[PDB]
Amino acid sequence: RFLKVKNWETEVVLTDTLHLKSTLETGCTEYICMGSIMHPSATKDQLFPLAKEFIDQYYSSIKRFGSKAHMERLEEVNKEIDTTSTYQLKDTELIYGAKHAWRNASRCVGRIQWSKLQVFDARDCTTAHGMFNYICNHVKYATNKGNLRSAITIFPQRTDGKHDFRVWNSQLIRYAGYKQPDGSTLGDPANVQFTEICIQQGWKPPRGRFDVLPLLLQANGNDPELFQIPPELVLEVPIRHPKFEWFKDLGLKWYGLPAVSNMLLEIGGLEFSACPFSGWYMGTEIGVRDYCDNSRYNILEEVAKKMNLDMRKTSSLWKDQALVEINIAVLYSFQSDKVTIVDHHSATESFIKHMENEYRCRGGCPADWVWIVPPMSGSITPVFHQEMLNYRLTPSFEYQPDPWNTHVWK
Amino acid sequence: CPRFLKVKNWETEVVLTDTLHLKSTLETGCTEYICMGSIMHPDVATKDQLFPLAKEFIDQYYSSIKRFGSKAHMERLEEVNKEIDTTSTYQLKDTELIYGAKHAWRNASRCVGRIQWSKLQVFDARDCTTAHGMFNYICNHVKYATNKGNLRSAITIFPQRTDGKHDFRVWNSQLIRYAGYKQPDGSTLGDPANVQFTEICIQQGWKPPRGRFDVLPLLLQANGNDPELFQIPPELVLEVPIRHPKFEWFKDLGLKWYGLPAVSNMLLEIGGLEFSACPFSGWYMGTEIGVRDYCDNSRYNILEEVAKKMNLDMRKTSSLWKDQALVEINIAVLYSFQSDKVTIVDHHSATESFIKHMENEYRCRGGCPADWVWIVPPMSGSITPVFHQEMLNYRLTPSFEYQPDPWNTHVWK
Ligand code: HEM
Ligand code: HEM
Ligand SMILES: CNCC#Cc1cc(F)cc(CCc2cc(C)cc(N)n2)c1
Ligand SMILES: CNCC#Cc1cc(F)cc(CCc2cc(C)cc(N)n2)c1
Ligand SMILES: C[C@H](O)[C@H](O)[C@H]1CNc2nc(N)[nH]c(=O)c2N1
Ligand SMILES: C[C@H](O)[C@H](O)[C@H]1CNc2nc(N)[nH]c(=O)c2N1
Ligand SMILES: [Zn+2]
């Protein structure tokens, strides 16, 4: 069936047909919906029709379905899944698969940009040193002195599971987290385990509040190897407030490049277990989640302190107030430093416009309301009132297990 | 379909285990291939359909009172069975009616207030025959529930559906709302959400004050007859003028709201019986007024004007001027209600209470259906605990359900 979705602020209805192409499960059933569950729990035979499907839609996107090039490519790929138990994507197929995996990313509010993706082929990589070189170039290229650019670096695909390339850092740039004897936590509490793994691998912690973690890179299934990203490549922003001059006295900085490196890019049944990818920040990512989550940098109490706010009852909304000012400061700081950043108002607008685009040109657009709606001021952004359908289109980015839980050390 | 599903809180690491989902009934609208989790809304029952629905609810009731399989239990089954067989329907005992209503609330995935589910005053209005009588019942409901500002949750249940052509309906989507008036120049006065309903009332004979905050009359339908207009006595409608603990100019905005939130357009289903008129009411979460009623674009849209008197940079959206005004407005709403000692809960306290409720439910009941999209507050989501809480959504019965707007289905006499 065709399926409709309504905006309840504008009463616009859209018709979704694209969902007829999904296959991967959502995690729901008729009886139970798991829309708020963050993670719902190949051979010659399995791989080919997946390969067939992806090739088919590639040659369908470039208006050559059934062409000679297409037919032979199907043969070329079949012959190769026989005699290697896998196959290699053409360069044009790599780029297309990467952009469409971003276009299919239900949880990403930035997808208006999906076709502007710089794709770095690192499938010739063989070592962690190789990986580090590739990642440094990625970082430098995508940072671009504050004028950020979207990029993905794709390393060798999985073969047998034993010989997997992995970036072990969940993201390319993060701040260390230190477990104090006195119970509390220095740095970023979300990372503390990873930070400990780096110390245990030989990293020398400065034990500051904002210590860029080293890269931990695994190439072809071997022990990961530590590498320090050259600091000149790691662009950072001091957070100040345009009215509160005491705000700089808080000591807050964040990095400019958001870059996710723990995910699995899947194209034509092939699995790229290492594919760090980056864009630019929506302010709330930093101002709300990183800084204000109780399990994170947790500064709300501190900020409300300097704002002299009455903090005895919840109903004074002191937490709310402090939150808004923290985010004003983050948006201000990046803007002041000509570092690319988007506010949640602008970003959500863009995504509603992008949805329109996809429904019109593509017949639907899988979106995850839970993730798309910003973590503050929800209903005063336009996607709150926007019904969305969620379904899994492929190529996609998938979660994969943390490497330190599957690795056989040496 | 697995026997034990697990949900995680990502802030606290707490994992909970859900078994109650096994007792799921109707569809969510979701499938293996697609999720309708953010979709707002994804001729009677036969004898054969009603029996297993009745026995289901009846078994459940005698299970709750720890008399499952007892004599009284089998006797009740046999009596209901007989009644459905002969009269094509059946009547609920008062005890069952009351259990059923509290459980429809308990089962309501979109309600963050469910920690109060067992404190519910049920008014049995199934002896009602006329709209005048419906008006009487609803007035008593409002007075009891309002309680001079010390609100109390209540539901009034009117007679169940019979053939389909004799439904009792409150035509008001809620008991107390403000009129909306479309103007010739396309502007709107009052509450822009209620324009359609306001025009219906005016047609039915209402003389509109054409104001910003005009409490609508009730439009009531008894036994499938044409609805009738009644004016709620003003002394029964408790109201709160909005002021700010700091900004003395806030009161100059001329804003106020009513104290009693009371949903009247839903259908209550118990043991396969359909109660098409069952107005129920509790108390407000501050954000319902301060964020949605006051700041939704298609509603009272006061953000711009509030921002103006706050003197905020309104040219750059990255100044977050909207966000700044929103907090202050919800600060004023909460403040105004507390001062007039009218019961209201802030989104922080409510969501925390609900996490404690949900945890208790998992403990004693093996689950607690919840609709994350509705449960998370429309401001400051992530700084409230429910944001980080994985939930599972499924339909347990007894339940509140949506039903068509009656003006779209009514056959005019
Ligand atoms: C270019 C600017 C971009 C913006 C403003 C943006 C915005 C966002 C935000 C705010 C999130 C939520 C992150 C979180 O809550 O952890 C997200 C998620 C995501 N984005 Fe984007 N994004 C951008 C670029 C990209 C790019 C370049 C890719 C891939 C090539 C991408 C793919 C994804 C994926 C797969 C997720 C899901 C992350 C997860 O599941 O943990 N995005 N995006
Ligand atoms: C006692 C205080 C209560 C509080 C604080 C509370 C809170 C809320 C809130 C904030 C919502 C979202 C409303 C919206 O955005 O439209 C809601 C929805 C709902 N509540 Fe409660 N509620 C309370 C009592 C009740 C009672 C007594 C019942 C039924 C017996 C009930 C059943 C429901 C239902 C069925 C919904 C979904 C409404 C819909 O689908 O439009 N609630 N509640
Ligand atoms: C799954 N939740 C835990 C987390 C996390 C996280 C941490 C970081 F240090 C950076 C990002 C970046 C997320 C992101 C990715 C992209 C491509 C763009 C963007 N704006 N944000 C996420
Ligand atoms: C379906 N979405 C549109 C709507 C609406 C609505 C309008 C109103 F004037 C009052 C309430 C109150 C909702 C509610 C019910 C109960 C029982 C408690 C509570 N706090 N809020 C809802
Ligand atoms: C349990 C729930 O799914 C979880 O808290 C989600 C909610 N929405 C989110 N939305 C974004 N953008 N990022 C997140 O990490 C989350 N977390
Ligand atoms: C499309 C989306 O489902 C819709 O805007 C929902 C979002 N969550 C909500 N949550 C509550 N409590 N009330 C609402 O009206 C809505 N609206
Ligand atoms: Zn679902």
Enter the tokens of residue B21.
Answer: 């989902």
Give yes or no for a contact between A175 and A258, defined as CB atoms under 8 angstroms apart. no
Q: In sequence order, what are the residues at sequence separation of 6 or more whose Cβ sits closer than 8 angstroms to the Cβ of residue A311?
A: A301, A304, A305, A318
Q: Which residues of B touch A300 (CB under 8 A)?
A: 383
- Method underlying the structure: X-ray
How far apart CA B150 and CA B106 sit, in angstroms, is: 22
A176 closest CA partner among A187, A161, A165, A163: A187
Residue in this structure with the two tokens 């060798």, named with its chain if needed:
A156
A93 labelled ligand-binding = no
Q: What angle do CA A319, A323, A324 make, to 5 degrees?
A: 125
- The length of chain B in residues reads 413
Residue from B102, B105, B111 whose mutation best tests the ligand 2 pocket (most atoms within 8 A of CB): B111
Q: How would you classify the pairing of strands B239-241 and B256-258?
A: antiparallel
Class of the CATH-defined domain B239-261+284-349:
alpha beta
A89 closest CA partner among A272, A262, A263, A221: A272
Enter the tokens of residue B101.
Answer: 């209503």
Residue in this structure with the two tokens 């001059």, named with its chain if needed:
A245
- A33 and B32 in contact by Cβ < 8 A? no
β strands within A345-405, DSSP E: 396-398
Q: For domain A236-258+281-346, is the CATH number 3.40.190.290?
A: no
The CATH fold assigned to A124-149+164-235+399-403 is: Nitric Oxide Synthase;Heme Domain; Chain A, domain 2 (3.90.440)
How far apart CA A229 and CA A237 sit, in angstroms, is: 17
How is residue A213 annotated by DSSP?
P
How far apart CA A379 and CA B295 sit, in angstroms, is: 9
Q: Is the dihedral of CA B341, B343, B344, B350 positive or negative?
A: positive
3-state secondary structure at position B27: coil
A107 CB near ligand 1 (under 6 Å): yes
Instruction: Cite the active site residues of A.
Output: 108, 111, 280, 285
3-state per-residue secondary structure call for B39-103: CCCCCCCCHHHHHHHHHHHHHHHHHHCCCCCCHHHHHHHHHHHHHHHHHCCCCCCHHHHHHHHHH
How far apart CA B262 and CA A200 sit, in angstroms, is: 60
**Amino acid identity, position B20:** L
A275 labelled ligand-binding = no
Class of the CATH-defined domain B18-126+153-163+267-281+351-375:
alpha beta
How far apart CA A402 and CA A273 sit, in angstroms, is: 11
How far apart CA A54 and CA A81 sit, in angstroms, is: 15
| Angle in degrees, 0-180, between the axes of helices A318-336 and B321-339, rounded to the nearest 10 | 170
User: How many CB atoms are closer than 10 A to CB A217?
Assistant: 27
Q: In sequence order, what are the residues at sequence separation of 6 or more whose Cβ sits closer than 8 angstroms to the Cβ of residue A406?
A: none
Encode burial over B211-248: b for 16+ CB neighbours within 10 A, e otherwise: eebbbbbbbbbbbbeebbbbebeeebebebebbbbebe
Give yes or no for a contact between B44 and B163, defined as CB atoms under 8 angstroms apart. yes
Q: Which residues of A touch B386 (CB under 8 A)?
A: none
Please provide residue A178's backbone torsions phi and psi, each rounded to the nearest 5 degrees.
-115, 125
What element of type H or E holds A69? helix A68-84
**Amino acid identity, position A372:** I
Q: How many DSSP H helices and E strands does chain B contain?
A: 11, 18
Q: Which of B326, B376, B382 has its CB closest to that of A380?
A: B326
- A30 and B30 in contact by Cβ < 8 A? yes
Q: Which CATH superfamily is domain B127-152+167-238+402-406 in?
A: Nitric Oxide Synthase;Heme Domain;Chain A domain 2 (3.90.440.10)
Give yes or no for a contact between B143 and B236, defined as CB atoms under 8 angstroms apart. yes
Q: Whose CA is nearest to atom 12 of ligand 6?
A: B374
Q: Whose CA is nearest to atom 11 of ligand 3?
A: A258
Domain boundaries A16-123+150-160+264-278+348-372, corresponding CATH code: 3.90.340.10
How far apart CA A191 and CA A168 sit, in angstroms, is: 12
The DSSP annotation for B345-376 comes to: E-HHHHHHHHHHHHHHHHHHHS-----HHHHS
Instruction: Find the B125 Cα to ligand 2 centroid distance in Å.
Output: 21
Strand order across the beta sheet in which A118-121 lies: A118-121, A151-154, A277-278, A259-260
Give yes or no for a contact between A240 and A333, defined as CB atoms under 8 angstroms apart. yes
Q: How would you classify the pairing of strands A151-154 and A277-278?
A: antiparallel
The DSSP annotation for B217-270 comes to: PEEEE-TTPPPEEEPPPGGGS-EEE---SS-TTGGGG--EEES--EE-S-EEEE
- A9 and B34 in contact by Cβ < 8 A? no
Q: How many DSSP H helices and E strands does chain A contain?
A: 11, 18
Residue from B173, B297, B374, B384 whose mutation best tests the ligand 6 pocket (most atoms within 8 A of CB): B374
Give yes or no for a contact between B389 and B357, defined as CB atoms under 8 angstroms apart. no
Q: Where are the domains of chain A?
A: 16-123+150-160+264-278+348-372, 124-149+164-235+399-403, 236-258+281-346
How far apart CA B379 and CA B294 sit, in angstroms, is: 13
Q: Which of B32, B40, B395 has its CB closest to that of A26?
A: B32
Enter the tokens of residue A39.
Answer: 């993670």
Query: Whose atoms come closest to the Cα of A102: which ligand?
Result: 1
